[PDB]
Amino acid sequence: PQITLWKRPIVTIKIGGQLKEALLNTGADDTVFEEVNLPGRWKPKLIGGIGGFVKVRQYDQVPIEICGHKVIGTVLVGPTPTNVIGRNLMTQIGCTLNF
Amino acid sequence: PQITLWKRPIVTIKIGGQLKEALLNTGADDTVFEEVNLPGRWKPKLIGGIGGFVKVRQYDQVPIEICGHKVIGTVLVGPTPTNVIGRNLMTQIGCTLNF
């Protein structure tokens, strides 16, 4: 699709056997979800850095469906007001900025 | 142009008589620059909200050239590690997400 930016670019996600929403965020390097229970191995990751760091769980090679596109990428699990699709997964669905 | 997302989408800016760089950030509602001296009227704006609020100067209808495109939009002036082009100005240059 082509998504204009007059509104926040929120899209539908299938992840961890659940239906979720997430923000397509070109300003984010990484992808973050809260309230998902992902299977398999994880390792801790420190992110943020302003005011302190936040410790999240890093899951590698997570299957995820983003707006109908079944792809694979790293997903961080930790607190976030809106789930975020970062560049690491936008590259996987072939998403570009165009003007 | 078409900008892929394997790297951070940094572009060249002309603003306030200066040459700057800024991040095209679809996760940001607003546009923020530091170290610019903009002419004309401004009003205070509270943004952020995590850990407290940050007070910035809001300048309306600022002429700004983004990657060769001369447009107009609100620019906030305050501290930011990288200058940010938010959705308010990406709409002005006709920028969309495509996949």
Helix count of chain A equals 1
Q: Quick one: overall form of chain A?
A: globular
Q: What share of the residues of chain A lie within helices?
A: under 10%
The CATH superfamily of chain A is known as Acid Proteases
Largest interface: A-B, 30 and 30 residues
Quaternary organization? homodimer
Largest sheet of chain A: 7 strands, mixed
Order of helices and strands of chain A: EEEEEEEEHE
Number of strands of chain A: 9
Keywords (chains A, B): Aspartyl protease, Host endosome, Hydrolase, Protease
GO molecular function, one term (chains A, B): aspartic-type endopeptidase activity
Pfam families (chains A, B): RVP
Protein name (chains A, B): Protease
Top keywords for this entry?
homodimer, Cathepsin D, subunit A, domain 1, hydrolase
